[PDB]
Coordinates of C-alpha atoms in Angstrom, one line a residue:
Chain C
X2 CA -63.3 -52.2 5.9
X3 CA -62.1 -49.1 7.8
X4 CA -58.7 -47.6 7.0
X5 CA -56.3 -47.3 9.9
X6 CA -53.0 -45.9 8.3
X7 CA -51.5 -45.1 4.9
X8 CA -48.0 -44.5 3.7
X9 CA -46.4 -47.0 6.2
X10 CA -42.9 -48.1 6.2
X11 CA -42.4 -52.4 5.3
X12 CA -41.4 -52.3 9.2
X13 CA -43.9 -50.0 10.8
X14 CA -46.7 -51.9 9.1
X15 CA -45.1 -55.6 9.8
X16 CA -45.2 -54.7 13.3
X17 CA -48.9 -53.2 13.6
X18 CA -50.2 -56.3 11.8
X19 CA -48.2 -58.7 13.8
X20 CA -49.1 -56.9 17.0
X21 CA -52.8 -56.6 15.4
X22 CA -53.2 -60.7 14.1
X23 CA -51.5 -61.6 17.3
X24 CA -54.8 -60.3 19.1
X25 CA -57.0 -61.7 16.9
X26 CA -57.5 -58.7 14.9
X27 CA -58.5 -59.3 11.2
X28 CA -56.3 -57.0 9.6
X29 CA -55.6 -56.5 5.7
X30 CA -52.3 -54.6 3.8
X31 CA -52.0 -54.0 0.9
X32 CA -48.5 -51.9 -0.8
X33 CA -49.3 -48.9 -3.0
X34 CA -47.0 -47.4 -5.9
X35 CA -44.4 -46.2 -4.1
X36 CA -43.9 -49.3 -2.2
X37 CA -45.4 -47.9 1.2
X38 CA -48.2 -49.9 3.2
X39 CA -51.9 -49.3 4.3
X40 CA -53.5 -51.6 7.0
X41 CA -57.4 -51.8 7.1
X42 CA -59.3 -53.7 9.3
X43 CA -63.1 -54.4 9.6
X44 CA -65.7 -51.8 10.7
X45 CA -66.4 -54.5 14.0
X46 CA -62.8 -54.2 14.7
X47 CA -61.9 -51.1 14.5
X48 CA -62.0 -50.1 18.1
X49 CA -60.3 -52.6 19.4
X50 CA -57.2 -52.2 17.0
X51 CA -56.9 -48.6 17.6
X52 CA -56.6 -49.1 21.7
X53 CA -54.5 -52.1 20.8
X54 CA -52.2 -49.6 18.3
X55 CA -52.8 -47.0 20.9
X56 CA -51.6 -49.0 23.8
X57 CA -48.5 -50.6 22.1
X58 CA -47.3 -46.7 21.2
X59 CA -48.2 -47.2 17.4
X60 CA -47.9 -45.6 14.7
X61 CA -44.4 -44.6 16.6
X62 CA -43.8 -40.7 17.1
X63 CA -40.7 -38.6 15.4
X64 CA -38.7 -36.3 17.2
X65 CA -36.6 -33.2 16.5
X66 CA -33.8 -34.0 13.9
X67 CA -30.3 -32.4 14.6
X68 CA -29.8 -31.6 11.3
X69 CA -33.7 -30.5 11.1
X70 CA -32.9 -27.7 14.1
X71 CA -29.2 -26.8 12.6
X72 CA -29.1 -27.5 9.1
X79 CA -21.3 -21.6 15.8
X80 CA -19.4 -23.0 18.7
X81 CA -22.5 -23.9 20.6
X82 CA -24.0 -25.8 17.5
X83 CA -21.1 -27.6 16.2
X84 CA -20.3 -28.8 20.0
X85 CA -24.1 -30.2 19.5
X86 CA -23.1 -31.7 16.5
X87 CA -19.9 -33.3 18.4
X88 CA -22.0 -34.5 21.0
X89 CA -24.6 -35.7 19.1
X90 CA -21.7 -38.2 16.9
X91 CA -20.7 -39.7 20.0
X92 CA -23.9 -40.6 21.6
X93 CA -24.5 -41.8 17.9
X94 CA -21.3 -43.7 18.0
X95 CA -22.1 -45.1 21.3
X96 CA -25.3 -46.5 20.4
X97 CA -23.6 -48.1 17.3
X98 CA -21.2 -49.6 19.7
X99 CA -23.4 -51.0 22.1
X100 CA -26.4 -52.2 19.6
X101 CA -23.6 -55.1 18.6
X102 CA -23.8 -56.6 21.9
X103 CA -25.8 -59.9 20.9
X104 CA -29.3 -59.3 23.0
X105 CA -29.5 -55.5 22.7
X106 CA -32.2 -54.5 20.3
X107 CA -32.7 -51.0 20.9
X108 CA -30.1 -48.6 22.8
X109 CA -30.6 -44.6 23.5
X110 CA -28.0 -42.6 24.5
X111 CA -28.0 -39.0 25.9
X112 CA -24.7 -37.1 26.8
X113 CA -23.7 -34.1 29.4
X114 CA -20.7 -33.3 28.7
X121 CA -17.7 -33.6 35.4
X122 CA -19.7 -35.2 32.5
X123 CA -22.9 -37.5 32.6
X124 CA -24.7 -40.0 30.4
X125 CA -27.7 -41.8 30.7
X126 CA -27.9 -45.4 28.5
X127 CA -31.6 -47.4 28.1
X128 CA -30.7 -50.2 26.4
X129 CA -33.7 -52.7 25.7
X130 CA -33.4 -56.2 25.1
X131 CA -34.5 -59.3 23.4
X132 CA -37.3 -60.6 26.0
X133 CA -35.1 -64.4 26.2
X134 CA -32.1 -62.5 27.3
X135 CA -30.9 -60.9 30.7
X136 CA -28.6 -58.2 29.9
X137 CA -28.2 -57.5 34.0
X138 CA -24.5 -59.2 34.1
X139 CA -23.5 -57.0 31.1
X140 CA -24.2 -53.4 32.8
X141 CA -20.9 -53.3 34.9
X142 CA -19.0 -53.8 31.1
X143 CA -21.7 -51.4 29.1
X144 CA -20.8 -48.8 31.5
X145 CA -17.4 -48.7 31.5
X146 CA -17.4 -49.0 27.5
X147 CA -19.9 -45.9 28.1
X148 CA -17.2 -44.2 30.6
X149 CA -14.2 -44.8 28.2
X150 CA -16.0 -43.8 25.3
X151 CA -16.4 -40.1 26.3
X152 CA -14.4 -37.0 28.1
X153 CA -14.0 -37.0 31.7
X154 CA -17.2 -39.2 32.4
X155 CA -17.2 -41.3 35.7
X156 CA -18.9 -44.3 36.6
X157 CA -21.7 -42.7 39.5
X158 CA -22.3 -40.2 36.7
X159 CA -23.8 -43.0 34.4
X160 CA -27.3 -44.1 34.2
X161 CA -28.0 -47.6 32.9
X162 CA -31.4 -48.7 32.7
X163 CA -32.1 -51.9 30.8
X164 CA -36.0 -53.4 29.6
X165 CA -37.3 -56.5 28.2
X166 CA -39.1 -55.6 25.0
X167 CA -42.0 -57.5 26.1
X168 CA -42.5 -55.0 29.0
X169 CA -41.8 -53.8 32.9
X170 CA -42.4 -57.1 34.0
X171 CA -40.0 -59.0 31.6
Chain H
X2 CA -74.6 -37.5 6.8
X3 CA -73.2 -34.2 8.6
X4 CA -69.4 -33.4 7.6
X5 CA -68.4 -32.2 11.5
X6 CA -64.2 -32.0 10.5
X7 CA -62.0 -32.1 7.7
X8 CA -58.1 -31.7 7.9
X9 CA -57.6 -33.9 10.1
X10 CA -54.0 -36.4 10.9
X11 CA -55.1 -39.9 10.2
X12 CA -54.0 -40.4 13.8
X13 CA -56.5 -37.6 15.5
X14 CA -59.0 -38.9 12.9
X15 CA -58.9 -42.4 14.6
X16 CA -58.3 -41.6 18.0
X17 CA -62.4 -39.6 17.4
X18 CA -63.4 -42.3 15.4
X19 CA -62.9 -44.5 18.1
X20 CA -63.9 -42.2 20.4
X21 CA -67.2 -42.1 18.6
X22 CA -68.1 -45.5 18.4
X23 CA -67.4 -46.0 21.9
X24 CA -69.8 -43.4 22.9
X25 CA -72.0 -45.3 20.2
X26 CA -72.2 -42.4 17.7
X27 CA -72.2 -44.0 14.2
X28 CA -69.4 -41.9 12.2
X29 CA -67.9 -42.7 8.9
X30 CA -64.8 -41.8 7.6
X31 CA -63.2 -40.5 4.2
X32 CA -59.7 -38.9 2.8
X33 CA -60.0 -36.3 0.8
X34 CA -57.8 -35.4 -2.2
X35 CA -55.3 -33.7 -0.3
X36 CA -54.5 -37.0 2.1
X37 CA -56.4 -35.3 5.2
X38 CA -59.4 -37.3 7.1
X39 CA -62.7 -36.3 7.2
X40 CA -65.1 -37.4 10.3
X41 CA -69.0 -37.6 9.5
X42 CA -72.0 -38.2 11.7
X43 CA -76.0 -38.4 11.0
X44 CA -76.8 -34.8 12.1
X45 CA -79.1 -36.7 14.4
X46 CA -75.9 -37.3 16.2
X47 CA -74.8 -33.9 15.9
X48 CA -74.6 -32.5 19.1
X49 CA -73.7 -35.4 21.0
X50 CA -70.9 -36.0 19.0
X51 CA -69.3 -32.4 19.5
X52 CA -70.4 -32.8 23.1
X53 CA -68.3 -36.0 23.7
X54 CA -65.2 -34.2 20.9
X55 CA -65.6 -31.3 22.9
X56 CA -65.3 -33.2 26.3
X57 CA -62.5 -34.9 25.2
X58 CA -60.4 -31.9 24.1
X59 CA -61.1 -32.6 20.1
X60 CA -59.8 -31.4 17.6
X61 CA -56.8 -30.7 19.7
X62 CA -55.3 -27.3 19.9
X63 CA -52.0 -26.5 18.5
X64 CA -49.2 -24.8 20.2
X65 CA -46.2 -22.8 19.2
X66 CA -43.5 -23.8 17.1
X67 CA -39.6 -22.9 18.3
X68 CA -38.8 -23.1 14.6
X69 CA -41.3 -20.4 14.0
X70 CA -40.9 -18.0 16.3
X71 CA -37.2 -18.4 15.8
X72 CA -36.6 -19.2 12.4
X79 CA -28.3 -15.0 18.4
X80 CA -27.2 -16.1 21.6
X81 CA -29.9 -16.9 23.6
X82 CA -32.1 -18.4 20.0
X83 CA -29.2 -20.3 19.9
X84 CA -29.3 -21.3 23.7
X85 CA -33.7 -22.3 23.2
X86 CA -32.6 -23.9 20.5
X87 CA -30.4 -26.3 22.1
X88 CA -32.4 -26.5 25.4
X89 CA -35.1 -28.1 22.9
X90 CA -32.5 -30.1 20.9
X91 CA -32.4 -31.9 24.4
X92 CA -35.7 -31.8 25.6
X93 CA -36.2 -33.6 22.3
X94 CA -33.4 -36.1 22.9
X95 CA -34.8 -37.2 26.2
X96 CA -38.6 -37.5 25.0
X97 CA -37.1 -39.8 22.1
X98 CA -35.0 -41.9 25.0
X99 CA -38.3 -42.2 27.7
X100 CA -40.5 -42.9 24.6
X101 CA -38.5 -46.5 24.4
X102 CA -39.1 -47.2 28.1
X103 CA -42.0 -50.2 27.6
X104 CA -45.4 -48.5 28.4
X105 CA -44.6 -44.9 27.8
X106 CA -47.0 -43.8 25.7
X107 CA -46.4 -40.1 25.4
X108 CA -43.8 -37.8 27.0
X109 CA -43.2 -34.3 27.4
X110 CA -39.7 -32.5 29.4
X111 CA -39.5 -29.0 29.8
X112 CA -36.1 -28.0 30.8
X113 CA -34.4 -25.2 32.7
X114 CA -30.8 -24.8 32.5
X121 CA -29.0 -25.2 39.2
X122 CA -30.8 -26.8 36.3
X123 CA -34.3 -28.0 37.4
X124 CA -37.3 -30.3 34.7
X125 CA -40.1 -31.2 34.7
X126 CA -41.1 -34.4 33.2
X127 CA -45.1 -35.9 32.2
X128 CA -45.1 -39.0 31.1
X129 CA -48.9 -41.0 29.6
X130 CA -48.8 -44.2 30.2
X131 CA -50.4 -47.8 28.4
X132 CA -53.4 -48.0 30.7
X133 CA -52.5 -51.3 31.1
X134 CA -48.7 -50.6 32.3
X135 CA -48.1 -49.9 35.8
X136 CA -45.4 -46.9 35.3
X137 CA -44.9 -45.8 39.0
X138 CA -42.7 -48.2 40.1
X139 CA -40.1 -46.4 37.0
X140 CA -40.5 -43.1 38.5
X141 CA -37.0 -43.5 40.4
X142 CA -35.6 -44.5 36.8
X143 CA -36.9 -42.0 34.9
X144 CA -35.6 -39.2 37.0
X145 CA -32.4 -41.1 36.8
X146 CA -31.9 -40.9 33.4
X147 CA -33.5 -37.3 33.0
X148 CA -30.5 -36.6 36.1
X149 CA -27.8 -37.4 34.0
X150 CA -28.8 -36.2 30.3
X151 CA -28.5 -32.6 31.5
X152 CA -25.7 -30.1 33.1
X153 CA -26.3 -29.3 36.5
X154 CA -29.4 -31.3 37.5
X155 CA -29.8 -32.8 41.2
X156 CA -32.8 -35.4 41.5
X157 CA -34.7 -32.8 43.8
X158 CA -34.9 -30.5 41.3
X159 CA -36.7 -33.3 38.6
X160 CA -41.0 -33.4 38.8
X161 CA -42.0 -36.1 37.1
X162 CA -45.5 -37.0 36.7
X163 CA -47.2 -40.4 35.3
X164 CA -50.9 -40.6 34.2
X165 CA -52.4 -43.3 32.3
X166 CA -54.2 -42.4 28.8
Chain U
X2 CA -83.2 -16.3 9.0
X3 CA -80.8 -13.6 10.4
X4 CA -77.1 -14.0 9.7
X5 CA -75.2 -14.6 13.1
X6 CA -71.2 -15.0 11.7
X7 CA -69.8 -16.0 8.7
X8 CA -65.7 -17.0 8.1
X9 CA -65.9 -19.3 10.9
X10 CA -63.7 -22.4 11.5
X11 CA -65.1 -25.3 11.7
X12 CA -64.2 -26.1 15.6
X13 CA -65.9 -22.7 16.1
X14 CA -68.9 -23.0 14.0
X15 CA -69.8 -26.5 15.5
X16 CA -69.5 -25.1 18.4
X17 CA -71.3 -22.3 18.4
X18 CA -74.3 -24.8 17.1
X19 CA -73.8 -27.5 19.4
X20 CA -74.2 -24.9 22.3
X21 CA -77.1 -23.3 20.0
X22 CA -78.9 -26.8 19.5
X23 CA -78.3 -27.4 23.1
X24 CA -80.4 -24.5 24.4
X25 CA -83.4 -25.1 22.1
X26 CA -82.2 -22.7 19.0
X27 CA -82.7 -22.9 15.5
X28 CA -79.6 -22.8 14.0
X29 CA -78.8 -24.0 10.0
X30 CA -74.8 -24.0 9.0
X31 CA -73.5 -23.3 5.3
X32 CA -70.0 -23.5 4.2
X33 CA -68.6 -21.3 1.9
X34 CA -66.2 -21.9 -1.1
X35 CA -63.5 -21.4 1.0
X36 CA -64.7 -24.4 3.9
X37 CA -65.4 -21.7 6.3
X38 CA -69.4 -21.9 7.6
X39 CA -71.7 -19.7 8.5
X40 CA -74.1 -19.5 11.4
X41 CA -77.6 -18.4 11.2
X42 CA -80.7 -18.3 12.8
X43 CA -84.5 -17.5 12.7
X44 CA -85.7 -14.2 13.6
X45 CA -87.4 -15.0 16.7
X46 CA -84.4 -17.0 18.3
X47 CA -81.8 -14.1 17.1
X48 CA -81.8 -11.9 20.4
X49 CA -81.6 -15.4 22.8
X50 CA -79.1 -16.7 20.1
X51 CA -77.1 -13.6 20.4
X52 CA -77.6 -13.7 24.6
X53 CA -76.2 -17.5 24.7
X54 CA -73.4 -16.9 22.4
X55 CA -72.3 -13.6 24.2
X56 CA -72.5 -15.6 27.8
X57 CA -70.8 -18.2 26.7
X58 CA -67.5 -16.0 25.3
X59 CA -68.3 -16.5 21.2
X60 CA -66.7 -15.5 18.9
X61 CA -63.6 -16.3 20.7
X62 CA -62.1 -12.7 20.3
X63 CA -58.4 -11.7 18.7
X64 CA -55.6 -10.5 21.4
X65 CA -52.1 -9.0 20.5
X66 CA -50.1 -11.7 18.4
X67 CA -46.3 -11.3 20.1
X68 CA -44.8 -11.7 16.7
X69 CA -47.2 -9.1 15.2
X70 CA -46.1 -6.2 18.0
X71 CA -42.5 -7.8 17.4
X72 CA -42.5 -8.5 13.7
X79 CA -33.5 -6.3 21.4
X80 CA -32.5 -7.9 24.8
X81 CA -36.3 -6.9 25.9
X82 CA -37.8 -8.3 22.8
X83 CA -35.8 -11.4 22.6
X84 CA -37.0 -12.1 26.4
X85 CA -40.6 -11.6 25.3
X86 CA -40.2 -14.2 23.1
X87 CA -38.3 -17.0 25.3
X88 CA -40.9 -16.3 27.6
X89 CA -43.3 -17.2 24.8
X90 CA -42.1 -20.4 24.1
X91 CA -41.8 -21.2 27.7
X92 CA -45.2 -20.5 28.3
X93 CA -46.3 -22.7 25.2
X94 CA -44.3 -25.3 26.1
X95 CA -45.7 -25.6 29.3
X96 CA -49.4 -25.3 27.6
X97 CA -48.1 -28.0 25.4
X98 CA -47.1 -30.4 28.5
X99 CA -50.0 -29.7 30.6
X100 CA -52.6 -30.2 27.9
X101 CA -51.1 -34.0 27.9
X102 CA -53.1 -34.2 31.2
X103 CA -56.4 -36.4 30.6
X104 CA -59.6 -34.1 31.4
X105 CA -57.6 -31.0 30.9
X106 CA -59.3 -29.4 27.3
X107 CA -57.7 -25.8 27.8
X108 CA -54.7 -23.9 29.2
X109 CA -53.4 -20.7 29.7
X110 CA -49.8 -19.7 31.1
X111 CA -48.5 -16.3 32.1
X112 CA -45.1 -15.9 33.3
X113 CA -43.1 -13.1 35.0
X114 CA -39.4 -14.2 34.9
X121 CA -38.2 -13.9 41.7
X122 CA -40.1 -15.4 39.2
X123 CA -44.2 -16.0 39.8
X124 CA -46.4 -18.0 37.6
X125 CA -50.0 -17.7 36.6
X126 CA -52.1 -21.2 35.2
X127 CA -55.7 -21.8 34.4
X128 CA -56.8 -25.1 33.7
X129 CA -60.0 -25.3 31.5
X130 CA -61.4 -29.5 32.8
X131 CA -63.8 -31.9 31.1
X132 CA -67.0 -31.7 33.0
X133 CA -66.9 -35.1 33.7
X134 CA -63.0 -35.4 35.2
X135 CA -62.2 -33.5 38.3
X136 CA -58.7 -32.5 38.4
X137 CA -58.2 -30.9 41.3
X138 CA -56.6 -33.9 43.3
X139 CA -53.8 -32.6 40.5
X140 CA -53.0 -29.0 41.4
X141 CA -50.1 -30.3 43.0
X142 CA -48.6 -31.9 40.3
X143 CA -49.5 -29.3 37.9
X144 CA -47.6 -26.5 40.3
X145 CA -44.7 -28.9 40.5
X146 CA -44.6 -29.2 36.6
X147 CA -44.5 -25.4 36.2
X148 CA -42.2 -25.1 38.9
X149 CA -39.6 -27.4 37.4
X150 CA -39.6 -25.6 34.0
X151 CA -38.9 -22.2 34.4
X152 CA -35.7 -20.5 36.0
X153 CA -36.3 -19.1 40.1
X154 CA -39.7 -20.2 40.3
X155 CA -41.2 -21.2 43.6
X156 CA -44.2 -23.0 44.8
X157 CA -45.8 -20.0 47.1
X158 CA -45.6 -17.8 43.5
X159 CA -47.1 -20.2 41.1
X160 CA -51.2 -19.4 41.0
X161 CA -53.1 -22.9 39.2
X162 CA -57.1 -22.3 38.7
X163 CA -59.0 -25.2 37.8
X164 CA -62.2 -24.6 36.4
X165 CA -64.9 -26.7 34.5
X166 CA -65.9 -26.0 31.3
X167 CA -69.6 -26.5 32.9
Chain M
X1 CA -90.7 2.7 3.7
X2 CA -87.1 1.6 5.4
X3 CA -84.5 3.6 6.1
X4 CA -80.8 2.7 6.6
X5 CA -79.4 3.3 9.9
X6 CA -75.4 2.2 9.6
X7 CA -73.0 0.7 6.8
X8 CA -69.5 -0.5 7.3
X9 CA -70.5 -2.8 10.4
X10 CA -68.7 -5.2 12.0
X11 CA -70.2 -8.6 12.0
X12 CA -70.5 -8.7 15.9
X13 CA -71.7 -5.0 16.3
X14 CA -74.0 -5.1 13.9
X15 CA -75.5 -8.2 16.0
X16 CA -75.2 -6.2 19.1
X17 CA -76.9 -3.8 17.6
X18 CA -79.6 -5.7 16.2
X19 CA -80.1 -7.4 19.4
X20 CA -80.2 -4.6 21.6
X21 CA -83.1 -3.1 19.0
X22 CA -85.1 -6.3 18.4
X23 CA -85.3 -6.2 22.7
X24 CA -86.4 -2.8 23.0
X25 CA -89.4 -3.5 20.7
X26 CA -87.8 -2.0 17.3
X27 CA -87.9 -4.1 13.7
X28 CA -84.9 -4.1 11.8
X29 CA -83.4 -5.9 8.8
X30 CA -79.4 -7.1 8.3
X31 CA -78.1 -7.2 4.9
X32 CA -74.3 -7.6 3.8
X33 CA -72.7 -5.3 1.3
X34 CA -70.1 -6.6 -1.4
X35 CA -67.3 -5.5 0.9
X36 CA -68.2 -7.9 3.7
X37 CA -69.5 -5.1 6.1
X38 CA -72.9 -5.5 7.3
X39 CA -76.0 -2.7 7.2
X40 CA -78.6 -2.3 9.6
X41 CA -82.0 -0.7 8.5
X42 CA -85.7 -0.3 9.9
X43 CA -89.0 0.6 8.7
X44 CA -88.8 4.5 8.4
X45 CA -91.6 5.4 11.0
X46 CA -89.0 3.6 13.6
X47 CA -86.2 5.4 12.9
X48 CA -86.5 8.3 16.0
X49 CA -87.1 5.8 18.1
X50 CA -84.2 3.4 17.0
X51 CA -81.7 6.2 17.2
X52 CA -82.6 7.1 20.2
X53 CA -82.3 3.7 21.7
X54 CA -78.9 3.5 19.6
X55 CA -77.4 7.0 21.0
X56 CA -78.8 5.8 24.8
X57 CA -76.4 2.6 24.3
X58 CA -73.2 4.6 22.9
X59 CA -73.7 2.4 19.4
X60 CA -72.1 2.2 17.1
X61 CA -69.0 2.5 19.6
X62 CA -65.8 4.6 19.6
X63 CA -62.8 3.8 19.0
X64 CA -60.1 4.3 21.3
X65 CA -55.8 4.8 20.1
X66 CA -54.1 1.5 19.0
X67 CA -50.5 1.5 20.7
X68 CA -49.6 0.2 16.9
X69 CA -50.7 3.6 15.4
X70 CA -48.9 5.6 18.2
X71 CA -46.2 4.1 17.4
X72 CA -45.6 2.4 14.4
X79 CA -36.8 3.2 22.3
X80 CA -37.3 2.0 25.3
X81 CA -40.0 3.9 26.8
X82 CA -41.9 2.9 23.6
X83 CA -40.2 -0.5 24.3
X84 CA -41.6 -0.7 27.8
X85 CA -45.3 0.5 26.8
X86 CA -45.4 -2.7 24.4
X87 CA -44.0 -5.4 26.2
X88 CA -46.8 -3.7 29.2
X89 CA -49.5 -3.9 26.2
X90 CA -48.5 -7.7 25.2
X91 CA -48.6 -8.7 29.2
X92 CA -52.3 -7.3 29.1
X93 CA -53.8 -8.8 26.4
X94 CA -52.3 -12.2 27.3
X95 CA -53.8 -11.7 31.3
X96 CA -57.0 -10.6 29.0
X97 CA -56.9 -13.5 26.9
X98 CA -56.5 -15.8 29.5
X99 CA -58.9 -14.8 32.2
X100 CA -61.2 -15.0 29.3
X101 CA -61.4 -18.8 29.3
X102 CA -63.6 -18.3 32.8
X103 CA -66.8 -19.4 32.2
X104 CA -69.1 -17.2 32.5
X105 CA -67.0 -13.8 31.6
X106 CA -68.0 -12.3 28.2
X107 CA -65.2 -9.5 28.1
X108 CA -62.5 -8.1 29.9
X109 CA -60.2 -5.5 30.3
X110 CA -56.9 -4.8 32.1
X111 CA -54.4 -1.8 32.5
X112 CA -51.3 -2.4 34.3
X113 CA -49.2 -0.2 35.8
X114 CA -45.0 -1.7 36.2
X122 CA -47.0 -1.7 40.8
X123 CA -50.6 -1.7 40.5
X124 CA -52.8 -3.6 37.8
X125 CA -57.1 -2.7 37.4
X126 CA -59.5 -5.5 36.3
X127 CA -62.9 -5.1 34.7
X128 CA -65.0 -8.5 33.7
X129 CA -68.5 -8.3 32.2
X130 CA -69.9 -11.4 33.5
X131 CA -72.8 -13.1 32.4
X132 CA -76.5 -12.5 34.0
X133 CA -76.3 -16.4 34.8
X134 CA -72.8 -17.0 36.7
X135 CA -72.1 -15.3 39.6
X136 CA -68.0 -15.2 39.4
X137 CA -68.3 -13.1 42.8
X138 CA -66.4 -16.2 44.7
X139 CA -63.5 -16.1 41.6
X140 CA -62.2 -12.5 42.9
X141 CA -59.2 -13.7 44.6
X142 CA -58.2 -16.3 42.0
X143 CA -58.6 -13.8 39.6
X144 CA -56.4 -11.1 42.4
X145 CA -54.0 -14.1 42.3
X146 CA -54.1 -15.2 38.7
X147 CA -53.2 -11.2 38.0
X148 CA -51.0 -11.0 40.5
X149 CA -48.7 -13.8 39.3
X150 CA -48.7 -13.1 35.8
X151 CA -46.9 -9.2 36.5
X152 CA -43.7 -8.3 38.1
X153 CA -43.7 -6.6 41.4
X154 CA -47.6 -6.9 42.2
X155 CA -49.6 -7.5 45.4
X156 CA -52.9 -8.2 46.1
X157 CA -53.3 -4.7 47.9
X158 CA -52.8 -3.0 44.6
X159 CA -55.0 -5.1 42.2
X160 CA -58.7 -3.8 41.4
X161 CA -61.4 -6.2 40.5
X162 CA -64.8 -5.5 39.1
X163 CA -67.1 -7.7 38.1
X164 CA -70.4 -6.6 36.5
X165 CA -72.9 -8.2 34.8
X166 CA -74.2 -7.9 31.3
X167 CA -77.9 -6.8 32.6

């Protein structure tokens, strides 16, 4: 067996092995101590799991924390901005469908939305209504200033 | 067996592991007692195996840290330009395919946008998209003003 | 066996002997208590050893650290530059086949880029794109003043 | 009988040293002292003749002022940001292959450029990307007033 990751959130690993068995990869996990995961597969495997992983955008990359960068004016107005988009994405995430939602903020303001959906649903005849929730949810922000872009999470094609 | 790296991310590890075996280099793999990978070959191997690392751009070199060399108006001003660089990898890296991302912005505002794709996603067609939403997360930004660039892994 | 370096990275050290092996050297490899290796070779190989090494720019030599010369509105600009030119490093290196970089800026602004390519990707169907990526992150920067080398590690 | 030559080398000199002794058809021996420095030595009959091909190659080397030392204002401002743009035009122009050192003064217009190349690259048809590469990195320079040497090794 060769090792492919350790110290694995429950959800990270669930989808890797999913994403892994689903391809006919024989993959093995197995919880440590703290309660974190390692996946294994075997040695015949192994390169076909990685470009699978690889592929698929696993393990998932982290980005700059707010509160990593600022733990002023300028900051706290980041901080402000940074609340809404956060209170946006709350907002829209409870639209049955929506999965995954990302929000960035310009604030004659701007916002751009990617909201990603379950693959059985069509979220097309909800963009007119997620951008003016969008529009109303923020200062000075009109509609040709917002960018909605909505995915299938099975892909580009749907 | 020839130790040729120690240190490594699990990640990189794999990524030449794989690399290895591809090239068909037999290399085996251990962590050592700090949680770091180490990659081994037959020293048979060795110089085809730094050969193809070497081709390949491994181990990768680092580059520097904002938090570093700024750990003041215009600090304060990089600081938040990265804040939202950050902010619009994190958004593109949801877009189905997207492998890896990288934005460089200058705030007329202008960016520059690379974006890896799945080798097995066709990404051009999003090109319009992307710049769309790179457009509106920033002050001041016109389209023309927005290069971005997709390769594939 | 003569001594060639000692207190080498590993990166450097297998280097070094790849590119040693490579051209029909004897070169043996130790590591120290502290993981860094030493090179050495036999007598007869040491003045070719030390002829390859020397062509080939090894050991990779030490330039002026920014934040050693600058442990100021002129200082703080050196610095932003700094990033900025790292930053775009960091993006360009993203590029498949590209396996070094170097960026100089002058902020009219101008622009100066070499590209380091895998020997077996050519990448200059990209100089295009890569003068448009540069272009796009840094302030008053225009195509005609942005110089991108491509050269092969080969 | 052997006879030291020099203690308190430098890894790479020491090689250089060696090398350049070992090809002009003079023994020596390397050791490393406890400080990390290295010593040269050769049999004592040799030792005329191994000074003499030492003094004929300038070895060991001078040293020349460290801009750190001098001083440890903005003309003093000015002379370090100038020394930072140089090394970093140094350290990338030495990621050509084939170039084993470089140097570069700048003047801020007018900028001079030597590269040792090695015996087996001929970086003659580089000159303008390395004009342009210079060029672009350094406010307020044209191509009129940037000197470029290249000579090789031998």
């Amino acid at each position: 067996k060769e090792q492919l990751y350790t110290g694995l959130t429950e959800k990270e690993a669930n989808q890797m092995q999913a994403l892994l068995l689903s391809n006919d990869v024989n993959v093995s996990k197995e919880m440590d101590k703290s309660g974190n995961m390692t996946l294994s597969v075997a040695a015949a495997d192994f390169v076909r799991a990685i470009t699978i992983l690889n592929n698929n955008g696993f393990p998932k990359k982290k980005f700059a924390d707010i509160e990593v960068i600022f733990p002023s004016p300028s900051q706290e107005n980041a901080k402000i901005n940074y609340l809404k988009e956060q209170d946006i994405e709350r907002l829209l995430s409870k639209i049955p469908g929506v999965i995954d939602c990302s929000v960035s903020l310009n604030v004659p303001s701007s916002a751009a939305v990617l909201v990603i959906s379950s693959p059985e649903v069509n979220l097309a005849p909800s963009v007119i209504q997620i951008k003016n929730l969008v529009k109303n949810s923020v200062d000075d922000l009109k509609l040709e200033n917002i960018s909605v872009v909505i995915k299938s999470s099975s892909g580009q094609d749907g």
